[PDB]
Amino acid sequence: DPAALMQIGVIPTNVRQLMYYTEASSAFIVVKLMPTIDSPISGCNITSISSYNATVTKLLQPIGENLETIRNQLIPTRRRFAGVVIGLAALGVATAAQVTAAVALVKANENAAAILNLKNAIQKTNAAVADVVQATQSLGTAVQAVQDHINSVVSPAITAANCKAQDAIIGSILNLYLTELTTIFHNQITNPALSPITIQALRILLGSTLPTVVEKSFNTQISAAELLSSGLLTGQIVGLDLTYMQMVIKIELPTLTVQPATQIIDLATISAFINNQEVMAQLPTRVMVTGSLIQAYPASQCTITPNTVYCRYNDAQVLSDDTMACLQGNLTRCTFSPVVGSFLTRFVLFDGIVYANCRSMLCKCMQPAAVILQPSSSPVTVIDMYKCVSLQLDNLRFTITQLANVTIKLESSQILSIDPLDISQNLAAVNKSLSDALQHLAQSDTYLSAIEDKIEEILSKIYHIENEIARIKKLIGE
Amino acid sequence: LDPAALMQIGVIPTNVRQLMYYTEASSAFIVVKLMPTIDSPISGCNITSISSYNATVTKLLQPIGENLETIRNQLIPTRRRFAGVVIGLAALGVATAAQVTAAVALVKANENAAAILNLKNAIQKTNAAVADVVQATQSLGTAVQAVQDHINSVVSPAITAANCKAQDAIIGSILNLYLTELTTIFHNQITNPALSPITIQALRILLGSTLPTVVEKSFNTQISAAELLSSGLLTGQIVGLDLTYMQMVIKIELPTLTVQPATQIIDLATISAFINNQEVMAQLPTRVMVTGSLIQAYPASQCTITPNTVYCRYNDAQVLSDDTMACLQGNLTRCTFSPVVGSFLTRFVLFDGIVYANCRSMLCKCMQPAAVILQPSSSPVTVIDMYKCVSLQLDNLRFTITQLANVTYNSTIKLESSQILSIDPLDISQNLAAVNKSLSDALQHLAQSDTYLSAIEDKIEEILSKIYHIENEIARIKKLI
Amino acid sequence: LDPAALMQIGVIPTNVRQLMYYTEASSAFIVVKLMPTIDSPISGCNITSISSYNATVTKLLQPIGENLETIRNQLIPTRRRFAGVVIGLAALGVATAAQVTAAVALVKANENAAAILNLKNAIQKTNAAVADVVQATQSLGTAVQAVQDHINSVVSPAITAANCKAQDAIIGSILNLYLTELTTIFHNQITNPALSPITIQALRILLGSTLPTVVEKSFNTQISAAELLSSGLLTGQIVGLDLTYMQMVIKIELPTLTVQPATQIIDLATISAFINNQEVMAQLPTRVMVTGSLIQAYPASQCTITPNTVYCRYNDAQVLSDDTMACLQGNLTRCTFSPVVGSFLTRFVLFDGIVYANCRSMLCKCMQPAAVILQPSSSPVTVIDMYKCVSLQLDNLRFTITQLANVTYNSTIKLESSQILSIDPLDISQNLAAVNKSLSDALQHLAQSDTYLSAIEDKIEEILSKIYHIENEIARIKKLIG
């Protein structure tokens, strides 16, 4: 919490809010894998069409078989899903996510079936994008990623002359798409039908259609530029027909809300100069604060904006008692690893002010023409208008115009290395010292046990002396 | 053999696969014709983009070409018909077993590669994206040209002073786009580039829309082109090159897998658990190989995975510690738990119809017997089969449970809080510094302690003396009487 | 300096390369026309795509523009001609050196930027993939349109109400593919988007089929277009942008390389060895920098590598521990080995004709001199040169050794078993917990040995007291008797 933690060299670089998922707006798409070629054909065969159909069908066999095993067999069983999830054993061993996704799958069964009910019209229609319609109502959108390119190249008629050439252009168009499909449909998981469709997969699958579909299916105020460039869009396969080669995907757009009393701070670190060496604090690069509570929170899998971080689920990791204390101001509990600093990690601008390691890097001020030096008592030296106005950090001059407002104590036992190999070597060293301490103990024990025995002899002598003084005292005393 | 009943700790076997080794392999030769054929007549015009493309690509292939020449037409076959053993390997400088292996293969494919480049003229004259290279009614391999179909599509029937500007432009963006991708594969960084493996990813860039056709046409295997294209099975290596004709000969190889008996590759996932008053997660390898009583960490990140099989070139196993083995072998007092920030996605798992959840860290609201499932401290994880709940609700997710478990909680769980620690470097280093600090005090305390000891030795020599004199003084006083 | 007698340990030098520092960098400007030119006449027809593409590419470039403004158009130049001062940096909020460095370079190029962004119309109205930007017999750089050629092939000579739907479809997919790729480069995540660098990856997406042409045209160095495109030497930054004309001015920068006199960058590979009865591997860094007697880990993950050279903008070196340095310098008693599961691929190496192999873990069968090479426990690795074997066979691999080794240099290999341990975090923590348990017992046992020490000192104090009385009587009975 105490950002006064930048005396050490760790500077906050961002403060975003945390958004969670409340509900989701959806849309159904039918990916038409086989394009429409309705021009008459005689005395000629277009082999590429056959091959594409065969290779793609085999490629989709796992998704299909999984779909049947789950859907068309153990959950909706020759009847109509009424809301009770049954036979989840069908999934074998599944994660919470997969189980969640399976339920969503059966819940979508009725819509997927409505759309697949029109598979035939969808196939006969030549179109890159098209509204799947049933008597005055839109079920969703039907897309075919290669249709436009195909229409540009197909001959109005395919005769025995055209043949060779046509089978070639259609061939390369289909095969290129096929190849990209190969990139997305690999049979490795047990329930592939339940794997999420990423925006990258959607791009491959929908080709040049993605933009059009993105707008056509969502009415939110969010622009098509955001949906495409961010990672909010995510979909899942909800239906398949291998004969018409049509895949029904359900796309989803999250409805993000902000979680109160929670911030997600980014921490960067410049090299400090402590106890005679260039070092760098060792802390998480992204933390989450909720009052006094602090967790590590890298949103590598979340969508990040300049002022917000939207995450599917919580990815927080617990920090160590020593780490927290260090973030909460207590700098004697931090940890610094030595480093080979460079220009890029020796300084940083922070709202006009510049924080830098002037001990490791030459902070040669120009206007005041005075070379800045750094007290061995200060890890990092600040630099505002007061200390300079036109500073020059090796090959880079620039003015300074702001002013910064506002006890140090660092033990060299805080300067360690956090590297497996390095740690194991120190561990070995510590262990050898424990072994020396144990030997010292043995030596020590042996000696004390020897004194105890001499003490015994000494007592046996005191007695005899004592008794001898009692007798000699019987020739003059009682 | 790994009590899978290590599930009481929250680790669940999510997969069991067979391991497969690569006995032999089938291969085929491909000639990548880098220069498109253009037959439409040219007159009163000069397509320059073709000149540039030729120049840039020839440079980009100089390193591979030079290397290929040095090894081949220079030192390994020694420009003398190979015999059976390789000679002159010092030519490679420093090489790894994988590279030497490839070098040996290079010279072995020497004969075939020659046969193919021997037809570089015909191969180049022929306009075709894919064509069979033939000699004496035999097929030596396949000839591909990734852009041909596209070029053919755009190039006009006759190029003339009128077209020139527009034709050169389209033929240019086409060749240039290919060039860019190609420039993404051939970067000279190593000392022996001609020996670097060609991946399916590079193979795709190199062959373009031609890949599916080639894959099908090169092997007859039962495996489908879909498996071949979508798996990582296929691999290739350069074994021929003619910079003049810009034709690169490549040898593609498809393995012939075999099931190594008595071996399984198990995937291990962990849900969080509640132990000694904290939400923790067991720390173990995520993928182990098992053979008898031997367990090794087997991260097959370099292999081809199937729902039932794992196949690798060479095993990438890692040895596990005695404690970690003890743990997976069933001795839970040896496992290691790290505290974690649980979430819905990590507090339960479905295992063949029965659920396994951390009902302390999560609200397991049973719906049928309408009760809140309470998790006793002596259970880091609860099991929920039909007998405990026929209708369960887990945070907005409701489902039925109609399968019965098989009681094996015969032995109570013995777990010490010392098993709960962080396995993260930073955290480990801090702990080590604490340990060391504690030991340094002891080492100091022993040094001072070593002083109160030197004092005793003294007060003892004093006593032994005063005693020696008191004895003389007594016998003296005694002899006087 | 670095006994390669580190080879007796199975760690071998695979590459020695020179290091190179980036001195000066010759630049060049590029104007990216994000909108193609359709000159053919249009009648009664709305090419819908041109509108949509435009609305989208624009909201996409808003962040880069908005930010690029608050910086250039509002807080560094300030409605006036720059004068080498750089004020108002506070506008960047918190910014790193690389960013600040860029903000400087931005305002510095502002002049050339606006110059180009002043020939908008000439650029827009012109129809070409690659167009030289000129102003009074001078090249201000190059203007480029990634999709132009393609569009020209497609676009009909005259777009009518009959061609419409058809044309809007072809043109529309061409633009949308490009738009999609652009959606891959321009996500708004940072605070100063405009400052983020442009990679050859981003560059490729942006200029498409143009890149090879632009590159060769705007640089006259000895480096071939091939290398500039294959390596990672090229970089650029967004200097000028105009949302209305959809033109982005970019500054491509090609670095001038300068060798660091003494430094050398060595790559270390390790084969398994057989030490204290088990197969293991030495735990050293993979790439190190060596200058005289200083050694640092040098992972040039970013840098541009060549068979003989390594060029980086700034260092990425890491400090090595004393034990690691001692090991790298020949003191093998300080190295660290980890038991491993060996494989063919990691059991041997060819070093200038001579093979180095673990012949305990692998069967080193000599073919010509016909014999099986045995490796004594004392040799963690064996060296097979021509003197030992002419034709060797390492299962399936059969080759000839024609070189001789002379590195017969002798030095006793002293290796303690405490050098064989795991470097895996989980394993380290398990070991640290055991060391802790001992430290724990030692401390309790110490508590006790502190109790005796007091009790011993107690009976001593007593003895020394009884020796008082006994001493007075003997001095009394000595006088009261004379």
Ligand SMILES: *[C@@H]1O[C@H](CO)[C@@H](O)[C@H](O)[C@H]1NC(C)=O
């Ligand atoms: C068309 O050609 C394909 C092979 O290219 C063949 O399998 C098919 O039988 C031919 N057409 C039919 C259905 O007869």
Ligand SMILES: *[C@@H]1O[C@H](CO)[C@@H](O)[C@H](O)[C@H]1NC(C)=O
């Ligand atoms: C795919 O080929 C099969 C024959 O194997 C045929 O029944 C089916 O209609 C084809 N699908 C399409 C959409 O062409």
Ligand SMILES: *[C@@H]1O[C@H](CO)[C@@H](O)[C@H](O)[C@H]1NC(C)=O
């Ligand atoms: C900061 O650490 C020191 C010792 O490491 C401790 O004495 C102090 O109490 C800690 N911070 C506070 C005041 O809680």
Ligand SMILES: *[C@@H]1O[C@H](CO)[C@@H](O)[C@H](O)[C@H]1NC(C)=O
């Ligand atoms: C510590 O040293 C002893 C012998 O000196 C050894 O048995 C132990 O393995 C070493 N360290 C550990 C616990 O790894």
Ligand SMILES: *[C@@H]1O[C@H](CO)[C@@H](O)[C@H](O)[C@H]1NC(C)=O
């Ligand atoms: C054809 O164009 C190339 C460059 O594009 C040029 O080098 C050559 O001179 C031209 N034709 C000739 C031989 O004049």
Ligand SMILES: *[C@@H]1O[C@H](CO)[C@@H](O)[C@H](O)[C@H]1NC(C)=O
């Ligand atoms: C590529 O250019 C070279 C010389 O510039 C020429 O010899 C060669 O014929 C061209 N490509 C081919 C093999 O047609």
Ligand SMILES: *[C@@H]1O[C@H](CO)[C@@H](O)[C@H](O)[C@H]1NC(C)=O
């Ligand atoms: C498990 O480990 C304990 C100590 O960690 C050991 O005493 C016990 O024998 C092991 N389990 C059994 C009974 O094999």
Ligand SMILES: *[C@@H]1O[C@H](CO)[C@@H](O)[C@H](O)[C@H]1NC(C)=O
């Ligand atoms: C252990 O602590 C001692 C003093 O407390 C210190 O000298 C030593 O460097 C520490 N261990 C290591 C080598 O990190």
Ligand SMILES: *[C@@H]1O[C@H](CO)[C@@H](O)[C@H](O)[C@H]1NC(C)=O
């Ligand atoms: C073309 O269509 C778009 C939307 O479909 C519309 O906004 C635009 O006004 C139309 N063309 C023009 C500029 O009139």
Ligand SMILES: *[C@@H]1O[C@H](CO)[C@@H](O)[C@H](O)[C@H]1NC(C)=O
């Ligand atoms: C982009 O759209 C704007 C208005 O929507 C228009 O002024 C501009 O001409 C379009 N792009 C260009 C520069 O052609």
Ligand SMILES: *[C@@H]1O[C@H](CO)[C@@H](O)[C@H](O)[C@H]1NC(C)=O
């Ligand atoms: C190598 O290490 C040993 C102990 O591990 C040490 O005694 C020796 O001095 C070191 N090498 C030399 C001779 O510097």
Ligand SMILES: *[C@@H]1O[C@H](CO)[C@@H](O)[C@H](O)[C@H]1NC(C)=O
């Ligand atoms: C060492 O053991 C003691 C108790 O057995 C414990 O308090 C300490 O935390 C353990 N090691 C460390 C410093 O983590």
